[PDB]
């Protein structure tokens, strides 16, 4: 059965995904996501902040239900954990000079500066595809670093989380002649190819449930009109 009261952890840091609001509200597209579905799924939802790497364990160890937190369905974590249908993607672009005629392709970075942040999923991927193939890989202790280097013209281009270059730098005055160069990357072990309800995976009626909510809220027009509010693209991917 489902349990009365279903606990979901999420790291309040990740606007316009998760974050508190100056009322210590949770707010963003996880939370409008995951109270649609309780509401479709009618069990009642509980909010829980959580450091990015409690998530996981807590779910482990049952303090937790769910997690919905921008989790990237990825290879790994599938070993451990059961995840709903992919919420939306949380891949990454490249962002370069506007007009720029960069590629995400082998062919057109060869040669080519591209700054990732230091531990960051960006940099494992550009490390284990792009570094050992010709691309010159330049890592960075400081994210808004990367960006005045952009500017400055000591990258060709930056790695980033697609969404938050379009929330914190490509929205910014300082990010008006930039864009993305190419499409999204995509890579199911470094990306996760989405998002998803993070869960154990023994709770199959759980996860059957968020996922009939979430099929049901996406055939409905519910979806679109949910991210019609952050976004002026197709967030969900795919």
Not at 19 to 33: H, N, Q, R, V, W
Not at 169 to 198: R, W
Request: with cysteine; proline share 3%.
């Amino acid at each position: 059965a489902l349990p009365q009261t279903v606990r979901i952890g999420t790291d309040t840091t990740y606007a316009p995904f998760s974050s508190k609001d100056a009322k210590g509200e949770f707010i963003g597209f996880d939370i409008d996501l995951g109270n649609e579905m309780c509401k479709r799924m009618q069990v009642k939802c509980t909010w829980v902040a959580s450091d990015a790497d409690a998530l996981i364990p807590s779910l482990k160890a049952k303090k937790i239900d769910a997690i919905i937190s921008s989790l990237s369905i990825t290879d790994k974590r599938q070993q451990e954990i059961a995840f709903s249908d992919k919420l939306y993607a949380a891949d990454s672009r490249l962002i370069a000079a506007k007009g720029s005629p960069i590629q995400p392709t082998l062919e057109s970075l060869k040669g080519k500066h591209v700054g990732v942040l230091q531990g960051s999923t960006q940099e494992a991927y550009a490390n284990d595809n792009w570094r050992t193939k010709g691309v010159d890989v330049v890592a960075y202790a400081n994210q808004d670093l990367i960006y005045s280097d952009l500017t400055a013209g000591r990258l060709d281009a930056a790695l980033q989380d697609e969404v938050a270059a379009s929330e914190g730098f490509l929205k910014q005055p300082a990010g008006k002649e930039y864009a993305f160069a190419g499409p999204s990357v995509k890579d199911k072990k470094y990306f996760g190819d989405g998002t998803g309800v993070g869960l154990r995976k023994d709770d199959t009626e759980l996860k059957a449930a968020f996922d009939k909510a979430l099929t049901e809220l996406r055939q409905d027009g519910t979806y679109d009109k949910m991210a019609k509010k952050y976004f002026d693209f197709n967030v969900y991917g795919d």
